[PDB]
Amino acid sequence: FPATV
Amino acid sequence: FPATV
Amino acid sequence: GAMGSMERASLIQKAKLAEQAERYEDMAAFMKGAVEKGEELSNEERCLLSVAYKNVVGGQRAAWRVLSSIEQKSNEEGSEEKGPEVREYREKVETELQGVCDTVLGLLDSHLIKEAGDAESRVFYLKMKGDYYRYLAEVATGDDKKRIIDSARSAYQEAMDISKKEMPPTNPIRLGLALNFSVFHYEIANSPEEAISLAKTTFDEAMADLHTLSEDSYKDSTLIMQLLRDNLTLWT
Amino acid sequence: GAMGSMERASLIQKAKLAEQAERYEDMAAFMKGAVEKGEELSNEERCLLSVAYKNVVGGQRAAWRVLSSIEQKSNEEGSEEKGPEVREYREKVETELQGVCDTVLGLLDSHLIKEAGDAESRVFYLKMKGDYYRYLAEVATGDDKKRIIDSARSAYQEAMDISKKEMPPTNPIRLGLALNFSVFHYEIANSPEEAISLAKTTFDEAMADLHTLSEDSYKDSTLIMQLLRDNLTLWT
Ligand SMILES: *SCCNC(=O)Cc1ccc(Cl)c(Cl)c1
Ligand SMILES: *SCCNC(=O)Cc1ccc(Cl)c(Cl)c1
Ligand SMILES: [Mg+2]
Ligand SMILES: [Mg+2]
Ligand SMILES: [Mg+2]
Numbered sequence A, B: 001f002p003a004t005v
Numbered sequence C, D: 001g002a003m004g005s006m007e008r009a010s011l012i013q014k015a016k017l018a019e020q021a022e023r024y025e026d027m028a029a030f031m032k033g034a035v036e037k038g039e040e041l042s043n044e045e046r047c048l049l050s051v052a053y054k055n056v057v058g059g060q061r062a063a064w065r066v067l068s069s070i071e072q073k074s075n076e077e078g079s080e081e082k083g084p085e086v087r088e089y090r091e092k093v094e095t096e097l098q099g100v101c102d103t104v105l106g107l108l109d110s111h112l113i114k115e116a117g118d119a120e121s122r123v124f125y126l127k128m129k130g131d132y133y134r135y136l137a138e139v140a141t142g143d144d145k146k147r148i149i150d151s152a153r154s155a156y157q158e159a160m161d162i163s164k165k166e167m168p169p170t171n172p173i174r175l176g177l178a179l180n181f182s183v184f185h186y187e188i189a190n191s192p193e194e195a196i197s198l199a200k201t202t203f204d205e206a207m208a209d210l211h212t213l214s215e216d217s218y219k220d221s222t223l224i225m226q227l228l229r230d231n232l233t234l235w236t
């Protein structure tokens, strides 16, 4: 999965 | 801590 | 709720203790209680709220993905009929996830966003609104799925418009908002080109502004810039 | 309880799904529901029960230790008065932990142990009884603390007596029981010499029996023997 913050 | 199972 | 009798300051203190103990459900319940005191949140308190619910819903999303994978394998050709149990338990986790998202969105709507006037607070809360509609969208399959996606998009877009007008391009909240809106484009809105364009433009404009920053602000901004780069590497 | 309307087989299926999803609270609630159907548990089902509650209470113990540490720092000389919050929240976690231990002990008492006739099931359940009294003892400070410790000791001792009579010295349940009873001696009963003696004698007697085992049984037994060795290295 892609990075989120 | 020591190992327990 | 059950936190109505506890002091606001005590709720904040215990949220910090729960974070140290990695008790994120507790942390979130304490921060919900603090929000419901009706006073605005400080920068640090907004961080406590977002960390708490991010960890809670993050665990639920991870669990939902495991179960959805098992469920879709069970529906392949040659798979044995195992009964309704996989669907039932995926639905149970899904319903609990939706409940947490509805709770967060409820806190933002009553009444965090309408009282947030500064860019740092308003952009933060609108990013959160986009995030928790995004999590609802990840599990949505019904009549309102397009409306959930547009609710995420609308919240992210309003946050973006404010952040571009009121924050420098290295501001960590602006960067984190762009990171997540870009992921929304890639994973939710079937718009990988928009996702890549947003991540690249956000990265390049932050790069050109790093020269204005102290060592500590530089560290904060480059941390999120690296996440933008990581996604671009994943996508190209 | 809330699982009374679900099929026993469906509860077991969902416990396995919850384990795959790392949802150990769910796993434990499903296995509690399965136990309360009143039928005896298979070997695999006993494993599901023990894994579920071990993970739940293990997280609570880890959290309790973090908070107890903070609490004792706050009570040192020169520490600022922060109010009752640390004690209150440590007590909250402690009460939830005691609740889980009481639930497990309740399942063993009603009526898992009294129906367990084979050595593999009876020793397993008595080890569990020793373990969950041991966890109660870790947080005990009141009038009944010595009685909690003796309840752990008595359960472990009965399990040991059966295991020595009815199981080979390499049996993994016998080994795991000895591992945990040895830790009970070291950490609860203030008896490090007994802890070391038990771990060493258990290790040596298992070593001498490895020659009787298949490759797969050898793997199972040596895994727990290594834990005995790890503790001996920690203690000597
Ligand atoms: S708010 C928790 C502390 N901050 C971070 O971990 C980094 C960060 C940066 C930008 C944004 Cl929008 C978030 Cl939510 C977090
Ligand atoms: S029961 C879960 C699977 N078994 C193990 O992980 C290894 C093991 C060995 C002995 C004992 Cl008593 C236990 Cl509880 C676990
Ligand atoms: Mg007050
Ligand atoms: Mg549903
Ligand atoms: Mg039935």
Ligand SMILES: [Mg+2]
Residues within 6 Å of the ligand: D091, D094, D095
């Ligand atoms: Mg107490």
